[PDB]
């Protein structure tokens with residue numbers, strides 16, 4: 208017997224929800240039955256009552272149960288995501304994704320256009336000439352032909368639009384900011400997942416563990432929702448349904464310390480210029496961070512196998528990410544991705 | 552540069568607002584400039600952070616600054632309110648309403664404030680209508696009622712038309728929020744004294760702080776059974792507000808010879824049932840309902856007495872109980888309700 212008064216009442220009492228309550232709430236939102244006030248109340252209360260992995264998993268599962276799927280047998284078993292919660296990072300994630308795909312690891316990303324001038328995943332890709340708004344059959348064909356696909360959230364999650372509007376109206380991060388990485392409709396089993404919210408990274412890791420994903424959930428100790436080069440990073444390594452928390456230092460692999468002012472994401476047009484520069488062989492702090500993050504995604508991919516060893520997996524990941532840039536394979540993959548969109 | 556992201560961000564970080572921020576928010580809400588999502592976010596966030604008296608006082612201040620006032624010099628300086636937050640989840644008779652009539656009949660001017668029920672079968676305003684009292688009079692006529700009858704009723708929707716945006720969000724989300732505190736703090740006649748019920752034990756102290764800041768003489772009451780009234784089934788917690796300060800007491804009616812009642816004996820019904828119960832009490836029916844009415848009327852009289860620095864607690868209660876009982880026993884309360892009904896029918 209579920210209801211808003213009951214569910215919101217329980218959250219304002221600072222109590223974890225009973226099993227299925229988060230799911231009921233998200234289903235109401237997804238079926239268009241929740242008024243904007245109810246959506247907003249739920250998002251704030253869930254946020255101020257620290258969400259648990261069970262609750263966030265319930266929200267993401269309901270969202271996925273409403274999403275358009277990709278066609279049967281079109282997503283490889285070892286596809287990876289590279290994505291962060293933001294709250295930015297999109298330049299790094301996007302470049303790293305292209306590098307990973309160029310290395311031979313299939314990548315399927317998922318995202319929105321940004322509400323600000325600060326680019327979303329989608330905005331930077333469009334600036335580079337990639338057609339981001341394609342239907343399931345064409346994303347599958349992209350993945351097969353180019354090695355990478357992008358699922359536009361507005362297209363694959365049409366029932367989420369009311370929630371999206373509420374989030375923009377309240378304008379501050381909530382539990383819904385966690386769901387991007389957890390609601391990729393291609394359902395990749397691996398990924399490098401950035402989380403800006405240090406206290407919630409462990410929660411996201413828990414959700415991925417329940418799904419038997421091989422993921423590195425990463426939080427830069429300088430706040431970045433990516434593996435940073437300015438200092439150490441905290442990694443929640445997810446494999447075989449378990450989570451190990453680690454401190455990671457890229458200097459151990461010979462990466463120079465950089466400054467934060469050098470790495471943050473900006474608008475889509477500037478992100479686009481930075482992509483072209485890095486993929487064209489420009490050296491410096493941005494390249495290093497892209498390489499490190501690409502390697503991280505390759506390591507997560509390697510973890511799909513029970514016989515993967517941490518330090519050797521990192522060394523291979525770094526070699527592969529560097530080579531994908533240095534040979535021009537990453538630059539050529541982007542060009543082939545642009546051409547894909549222009550040829551139907 | 553105040554904004555919703557700023558204010559909501561601060562509340563969701565579990566931080567108290569800066570001075571002026573709650574006021575800014577409430578003012579956006581009252582002028583129709585707040586989206587429903589923003590209203591609901593604000594109400595919920597503030598509730599979970601734990602509102603301060605400064606914050607709640609700002610909200611109520613903004614409401615009062617937008618309300619229709621009564622004409623100048625028409626509200627006596629010692630007028631009292633008898634009103635509560637509601638939301639106690641018990642279907643009780645309209646104890647504040649019955650106590651208000653008794654208090655007015657004892658000679659203390661009363662200006663009540665209210666709406667038609669949120670989640671009981673019958674609110675104070677619904678029960679008054681069923682008795683034949685006109686609830687929806689304007690400022691001039693409320694002031695005239697106060698002068699001619701000794702009591703007036705300010706219909707919350709009539710006096711706070713701009714609250715409609717907040718009210719609708721409250722109804723949509725259902726859960727109690729800080730907004731549930733505002734009714735008793737926003738009587739448009741601005742009485743300086745009152746017996747104020749609070750269903751939410753954790754927020755009563757906050758309400759008491761708001762009244763202390765305005766230099767009101769108020770008893771903020773929470774029955775330890777959960778009632779937003781002085782109860783007869785058990786003890787009540789009272790936050791006594793006098794001289795700009797608050798002190799917390801526990802009140803036991805056994806100390807004044809009241810027998811313990813059971814909660815189901817104070818149960819009410821629809822507006823006709825509760826109207827019938829008002830008629831029975833004013834007519835001299837003895838029993839648990841009368842006891843609770845007499846106790847609550849006495850509490851409002853004690854609050855009124857506290858407008859003087861000289862008032863002492865136990866003498867005040869004894870006087871209040873004598874006055875409340877006499878007002879019923881002499882027929883003064885029954886006659887005042889009749890005179891109130893007649894006043895309204897004569898336009």
Ligand SMILES: O=P(O)(O)OC[C@H]1O[C@H](OP(=O)(O)OP(=O)(O)O)[C@H](O)[C@@H]1O
Nearest residue numbers: 290291292293296297300319327328401
């Ligand atoms: O606010 P939203 O539209 O929901 O998007 C949140 C994040 O998702 C995208 O990141 P990306 O996928 O590039 O990962 P990254 O942030 O780790 O670069 C976008 O650039 C934001 O950083």
Ligand SMILES: O=P(O)(O)OC[C@H]1O[C@H](OP(=O)(O)OP(=O)(O)O)[C@H](O)[C@@H]1O
Nearest residue numbers: 634635636637645646647648669674675
């Ligand atoms: O939920 P709302 O519509 O905001 O109203 C809250 C309370 O206001 C009235 O109480 P009051 O103490 O004035 O009257 P009663 O005790 O006589 O019922 C009403 O009867 C509710 O109890």
Ligand SMILES: [Mg+2]
Nearest residue numbers: 634635647748
């Ligand atoms: Mg009451």
Ligand SMILES: [Mg+2]
Nearest residue numbers: 635637779780
């Ligand atoms: Mg009550």
